[PDB]
Short mmCIF file of C-alpha atoms and ligand atoms in Angstrom, two decimals:
data_model
loop_
_atom_site.label_atom_id
_atom_site.label_comp_id
_atom_site.label_asym_id
_atom_site.label_seq_id
_atom_site.Cartn_x
_atom_site.Cartn_y
_atom_site.Cartn_z
CA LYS A 10 0.15 0.05 0.46
CA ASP A 11 2.59 2.57 0.97
CA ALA A 12 6.63 3.19 0.81
CA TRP A 13 6.93 0.94 4.58
CA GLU A 14 5.38 -2.30 2.92
CA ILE A 15 7.60 -5.14 2.88
CA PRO A 16 7.66 -8.29 1.17
CA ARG A 17 7.81 -11.50 4.07
CA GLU A 18 10.58 -12.79 2.24
CA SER A 19 12.94 -10.23 4.53
CA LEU A 20 11.87 -11.30 7.32
CA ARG A 21 13.28 -14.32 9.02
CA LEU A 22 11.13 -15.18 12.96
CA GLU A 23 14.56 -16.41 14.81
CA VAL A 24 13.21 -16.24 18.56
CA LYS A 25 9.41 -16.22 20.23
CA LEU A 26 10.83 -12.85 22.61
CA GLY A 27 6.89 -12.87 24.12
CA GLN A 28 2.83 -13.40 23.71
CA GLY A 29 -0.22 -11.56 23.56
CA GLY A 32 -0.17 -11.80 18.02
CA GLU A 33 3.12 -12.14 19.26
CA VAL A 34 5.97 -11.00 19.13
CA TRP A 35 10.07 -12.47 18.09
CA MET A 36 13.01 -11.04 17.18
CA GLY A 37 13.32 -11.64 13.09
CA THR A 38 16.39 -10.59 11.51
CA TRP A 39 15.44 -7.90 7.53
CA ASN A 40 16.99 -8.55 4.85
CA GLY A 41 18.70 -11.65 6.88
CA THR A 42 21.28 -8.85 7.91
CA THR A 43 19.32 -6.72 10.18
CA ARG A 44 18.63 -7.21 13.62
CA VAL A 45 14.73 -6.62 14.25
CA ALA A 46 11.83 -7.12 16.48
CA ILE A 47 8.81 -8.45 14.84
CA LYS A 48 5.66 -8.25 16.12
CA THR A 49 2.83 -10.86 14.29
CA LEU A 50 -1.08 -10.38 14.87
CA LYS A 51 -3.51 -13.82 15.32
CA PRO A 52 -6.78 -12.99 13.76
CA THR A 54 -7.96 -10.47 16.85
CA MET A 55 -8.62 -7.08 16.31
CA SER A 56 -8.64 -5.12 12.45
CA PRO A 57 -6.12 -5.62 9.93
CA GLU A 58 -6.79 -1.44 9.81
CA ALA A 59 -6.89 -1.55 13.73
CA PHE A 60 -3.74 -3.46 14.57
CA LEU A 61 -2.38 -0.75 11.20
CA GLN A 62 -2.89 2.34 13.91
CA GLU A 63 -0.15 1.30 15.81
CA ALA A 64 2.28 1.90 12.71
CA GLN A 65 -0.10 4.48 11.15
CA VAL A 66 1.59 6.52 14.25
CA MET A 67 4.88 5.42 14.52
CA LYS A 68 5.29 7.20 10.75
CA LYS A 69 5.01 10.31 12.02
CA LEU A 70 6.79 10.05 14.93
CA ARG A 71 10.94 10.04 14.14
CA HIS A 72 12.96 10.69 17.61
CA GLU A 73 16.30 8.72 19.51
CA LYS A 74 14.17 7.72 22.47
CA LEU A 75 11.27 6.30 20.48
CA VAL A 76 11.02 2.92 19.27
CA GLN A 77 11.43 3.82 15.58
CA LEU A 78 8.79 1.97 12.62
CA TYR A 79 11.15 -0.09 9.80
CA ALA A 80 8.31 -1.84 8.23
CA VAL A 81 5.16 -3.31 7.82
CA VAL A 82 3.25 -6.24 5.79
CA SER A 83 0.09 -5.57 5.63
CA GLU A 84 -0.48 -9.38 4.59
CA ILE A 87 -0.04 -8.89 9.85
CA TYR A 88 4.13 -7.97 10.37
CA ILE A 89 5.42 -4.75 12.21
CA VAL A 90 9.07 -4.10 12.25
CA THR A 91 10.76 -2.15 14.64
CA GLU A 92 14.34 -1.88 15.61
CA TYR A 93 15.54 -4.26 18.04
CA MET A 94 16.48 -3.31 21.98
CA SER A 95 18.39 -6.35 22.88
CA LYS A 96 17.06 -5.71 26.59
CA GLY A 97 13.22 -5.71 26.62
CA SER A 98 10.60 -3.70 28.85
CA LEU A 99 11.93 -1.72 32.08
CA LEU A 100 10.38 -3.57 34.03
CA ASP A 101 12.04 -7.19 32.84
CA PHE A 102 15.23 -5.12 33.31
CA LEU A 103 14.33 -3.66 36.55
CA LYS A 104 13.09 -7.31 37.95
CA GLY A 105 16.02 -8.96 36.16
CA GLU A 106 19.18 -9.58 38.32
CA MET A 107 20.14 -6.33 36.58
CA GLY A 108 18.27 -4.03 39.07
CA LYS A 109 20.14 -4.51 41.81
CA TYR A 110 23.00 -2.84 40.83
CA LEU A 111 20.85 -0.19 39.55
CA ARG A 112 21.15 2.78 41.41
CA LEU A 113 19.85 6.39 41.66
CA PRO A 114 22.11 7.64 38.75
CA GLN A 115 21.39 5.05 36.76
CA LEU A 116 17.63 5.18 37.06
CA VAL A 117 17.10 8.98 36.81
CA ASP A 118 19.08 9.04 33.28
CA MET A 119 16.45 6.19 32.07
CA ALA A 120 13.74 8.97 33.69
CA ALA A 121 15.43 11.76 31.71
CA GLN A 122 16.02 9.56 28.24
CA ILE A 123 11.87 8.46 29.01
CA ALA A 124 11.15 12.10 29.27
CA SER A 125 12.20 13.44 26.23
CA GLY A 126 11.10 11.11 23.75
CA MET A 127 7.60 12.01 25.69
CA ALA A 128 8.79 15.63 25.50
CA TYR A 129 8.87 15.04 22.12
CA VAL A 130 5.59 13.67 21.79
CA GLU A 131 4.53 16.80 24.15
CA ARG A 132 5.56 19.34 20.95
CA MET A 133 4.22 17.06 18.22
CA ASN A 134 0.65 17.15 20.14
CA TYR A 135 0.18 13.52 20.50
CA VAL A 136 -0.60 11.60 23.71
CA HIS A 137 -0.03 7.78 24.45
CA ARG A 138 -2.32 7.24 26.74
CA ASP A 139 -0.47 4.27 28.66
CA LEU A 140 2.97 5.18 29.47
CA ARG A 141 4.61 2.70 32.07
CA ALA A 142 7.16 0.13 32.36
CA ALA A 143 5.94 -2.61 30.80
CA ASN A 144 5.65 0.12 27.13
CA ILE A 145 9.99 1.45 27.35
CA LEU A 146 12.31 -0.67 26.58
CA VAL A 147 15.92 -0.78 27.47
CA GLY A 148 18.13 -1.33 25.06
CA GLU A 149 22.72 -2.03 25.60
CA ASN A 150 23.76 0.77 27.94
CA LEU A 151 21.06 1.71 29.80
CA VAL A 152 18.80 3.14 26.15
CA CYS A 153 15.60 3.44 27.01
CA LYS A 154 12.68 3.90 23.80
CA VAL A 155 9.20 4.60 24.74
CA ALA A 156 7.30 1.89 22.65
CA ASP A 157 4.02 0.18 23.09
CA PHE A 158 1.96 -3.82 22.59
CA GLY A 159 -1.57 -4.48 23.34
CA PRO A 178 -4.42 0.25 33.66
CA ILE A 179 -6.16 2.58 36.04
CA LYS A 180 -3.34 2.23 38.95
CA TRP A 181 -1.02 4.50 36.34
CA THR A 182 -3.98 6.70 34.79
CA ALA A 183 -4.80 9.92 35.72
CA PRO A 184 -8.31 10.74 37.39
CA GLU A 185 -10.05 12.46 34.66
CA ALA A 186 -8.71 10.20 31.97
CA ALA A 187 -9.83 7.00 33.62
CA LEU A 188 -13.27 8.75 34.82
CA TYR A 189 -14.09 10.30 31.96
CA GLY A 190 -12.16 10.57 28.40
CA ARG A 191 -10.47 13.57 29.62
CA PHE A 192 -6.83 11.96 28.15
CA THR A 193 -4.50 14.95 27.38
CA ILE A 194 -0.38 14.61 27.51
CA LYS A 195 -1.10 15.83 30.64
CA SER A 196 -2.60 12.69 31.71
CA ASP A 197 0.69 10.95 30.77
CA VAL A 198 2.63 13.41 33.21
CA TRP A 199 0.54 11.94 35.52
CA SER A 200 1.56 8.19 34.54
CA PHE A 201 5.29 9.53 34.57
CA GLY A 202 4.70 9.41 37.77
CA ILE A 203 4.03 6.49 38.81
CA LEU A 204 7.02 5.95 36.99
CA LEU A 205 8.54 7.22 38.93
CA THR A 206 7.83 5.04 41.69
CA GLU A 207 8.50 1.78 39.65
CA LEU A 208 11.72 2.89 38.76
CA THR A 209 12.28 3.58 42.60
CA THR A 210 11.04 0.77 43.72
CA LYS A 211 12.69 -1.31 40.33
CA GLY A 212 9.48 -2.79 39.01
CA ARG A 213 7.06 -3.31 42.43
CA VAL A 214 3.22 -2.67 41.04
CA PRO A 215 1.98 0.76 42.31
CA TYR A 216 -0.10 1.12 45.41
CA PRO A 217 0.93 -2.07 47.14
CA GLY A 218 -1.60 -3.96 48.81
CA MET A 219 -4.42 -2.27 46.65
CA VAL A 220 -7.07 -3.52 44.37
CA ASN A 221 -8.38 -0.86 41.65
CA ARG A 222 -11.63 0.27 42.42
CA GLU A 223 -9.83 0.97 45.93
CA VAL A 224 -6.72 3.19 44.77
CA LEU A 225 -9.44 4.69 42.80
CA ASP A 226 -11.16 5.29 45.65
CA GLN A 227 -8.11 6.72 47.79
CA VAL A 228 -6.60 8.93 45.40
CA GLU A 229 -10.00 11.03 44.62
CA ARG A 230 -9.48 12.00 48.60
CA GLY A 231 -6.33 12.90 48.50
CA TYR A 232 -3.64 10.01 48.77
CA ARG A 233 -1.15 9.79 47.21
CA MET A 234 2.20 7.50 47.11
CA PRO A 235 5.29 7.27 49.64
CA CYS A 236 8.47 8.79 49.26
CA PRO A 237 10.13 5.01 48.59
CA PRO A 238 12.33 3.60 50.44
CA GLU A 239 15.84 5.26 50.31
CA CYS A 240 14.30 7.66 47.67
CA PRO A 241 15.04 11.29 47.73
CA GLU A 242 12.23 13.18 49.17
CA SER A 243 12.88 16.29 46.54
CA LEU A 244 12.87 13.60 43.69
CA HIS A 245 9.03 12.96 45.82
CA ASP A 246 8.07 15.99 45.46
CA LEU A 247 8.38 15.64 41.58
CA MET A 248 5.98 12.51 41.46
CA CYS A 249 3.81 14.39 43.89
CA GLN A 250 4.08 17.53 41.13
CA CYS A 251 3.29 14.37 38.12
CA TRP A 252 -0.07 13.97 40.38
CA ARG A 253 -1.40 17.31 40.71
CA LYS A 254 -5.51 17.28 40.81
CA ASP A 255 -5.37 20.27 38.91
CA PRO A 256 -4.18 18.84 34.62
CA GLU A 257 -2.28 22.20 33.90
CA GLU A 258 -0.93 22.63 36.92
CA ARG A 259 1.22 19.41 35.84
CA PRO A 260 4.90 20.26 34.10
CA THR A 261 5.31 19.55 30.48
CA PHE A 262 7.88 17.10 30.01
CA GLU A 263 10.03 19.68 28.74
CA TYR A 264 10.30 20.20 32.40
CA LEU A 265 10.95 17.01 33.81
CA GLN A 266 13.74 16.07 31.50
CA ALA A 267 15.70 19.16 32.40
CA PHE A 268 14.72 18.72 35.62
CA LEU A 269 15.97 14.89 35.33
CA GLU A 270 19.56 16.29 33.36
CA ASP A 271 20.67 17.99 36.38
CA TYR A 272 18.98 16.41 39.46
CA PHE A 273 22.43 15.60 40.65
CA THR A 274 24.12 19.27 40.06
CA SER A 275 21.06 21.46 40.97
CA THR A 276 19.32 19.00 43.26
CA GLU A 277 20.81 16.97 45.39
CA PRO A 278 25.00 18.08 44.96
CA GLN A 279 25.48 16.16 47.63
CA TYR A 280 23.95 12.49 47.02
CA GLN A 281 25.32 9.90 48.36
CA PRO A 282 25.31 6.02 47.03
CA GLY A 283 22.67 3.73 49.57
CA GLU A 284 22.42 0.16 49.84
CA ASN A 285 19.83 -0.25 47.09
CA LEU A 286 19.86 3.35 45.85
N1 PD3 B 301 12.17 -3.67 19.29
C1 PD3 B 301 11.62 -4.87 21.07
N2 PD3 B 301 12.67 -5.80 20.98
C2 PD3 B 301 12.56 -6.29 21.84
N3 PD3 B 301 11.48 -6.64 22.39
C3 PD3 B 301 10.25 -6.34 21.82
C4 PD3 B 301 10.75 -5.04 21.27
C5 PD3 B 301 10.10 -3.94 21.27
C6 PD3 B 301 9.43 -2.35 20.18
C7 PD3 B 301 8.10 -2.73 19.13
C8 PD3 B 301 7.61 -4.07 18.87
C9 PD3 B 301 6.29 -3.81 18.60
C10 PD3 B 301 5.49 -3.30 18.53
C11 PD3 B 301 6.15 -1.72 18.96
N4 PD3 B 301 4.97 -0.69 18.57
C12 PD3 B 301 4.84 0.55 19.01
O1 PD3 B 301 5.78 0.61 19.65
N5 PD3 B 301 3.89 1.06 18.94
C13 PD3 B 301 3.34 2.22 19.26
C14 PD3 B 301 2.44 2.74 18.58
C15 PD3 B 301 2.18 4.06 19.27
C16 PD3 B 301 3.26 5.03 18.86
C17 PD3 B 301 4.06 4.52 19.60
C18 PD3 B 301 5.71 5.99 20.09
F1 PD3 B 301 5.68 6.33 19.35
F2 PD3 B 301 5.26 6.21 20.94
F3 PD3 B 301 6.21 5.10 21.12
C19 PD3 B 301 5.11 3.25 19.55
C20 PD3 B 301 6.77 -1.71 19.31
N6 PD3 B 301 8.68 -4.32 22.07
N7 PD3 B 301 9.23 -5.61 22.44
C21 PD3 B 301 8.58 -6.59 23.93
C22 PD3 B 301 8.80 -5.84 25.45
C23 PD3 B 301 8.98 -7.68 25.65
C24 PD3 B 301 8.97 -8.72 24.90
C25 PD3 B 301 8.73 -8.28 23.43
#
């Protein structure tokens, strides 16, 4: 149909990375390592391809790049050698990560979202599970397919904006700071909602600088137009150890 189309004989689904459709570790044109997401006919093809249409209008360093499609369905993109942020934080790598390596990822994620912000788009499902990791702590926003991650106005009235994503980023920090634990521990969905409305907000994680929890609390402000742009968030996490915590010192796990 368009310049992105590719012949299925270019691909080679070498390893099955996950389930679903599903995700494989193919190889485009037998020389390029890539990731292949397939579809098991359950949604419409034109519905499944909506994910590809969007990836053609967004090209940034902290965003997983689209390479080519197969409308007869395959979606080819760059390959992130270390799976999602979740698996990574929960793997045996998560014990070696400290605040600096975690703020560095938080900031990169904020940057791809700063691009999104400028592009006037909204991700809607910004969370650790949809943030891929590659070599040298590289991170990129992604997608494949969550009230504990969704902003009040969004889940309650469908009011999804980039400010609702700012809410989700805030919840991402608790994931990076807890290294993979589910937000709002011990609480069930319709208990999270009834609670957050009442003013509740997650407490500062163990060994997490109160200045970093301060930022979370800004990403969780009740009034949407009060949360920060990703532009502020990115810069904030870029200057963290100089402007905010210049006396920081390594801890047991943070
Ligand atoms: N490159 C990869 N390499 C190894 N694993 C990968 C991927 C990927 C990237 C990938 C694979 C298949 C589809 C996508 N789709 C999208 O990123 N879609 C998307 C749709 C709209 C917007 C955006 C974005 F630009 F905002 F990121 C992204 C992304 N996902 N995964 C999964 C995560 C753990 C199980 C495997």
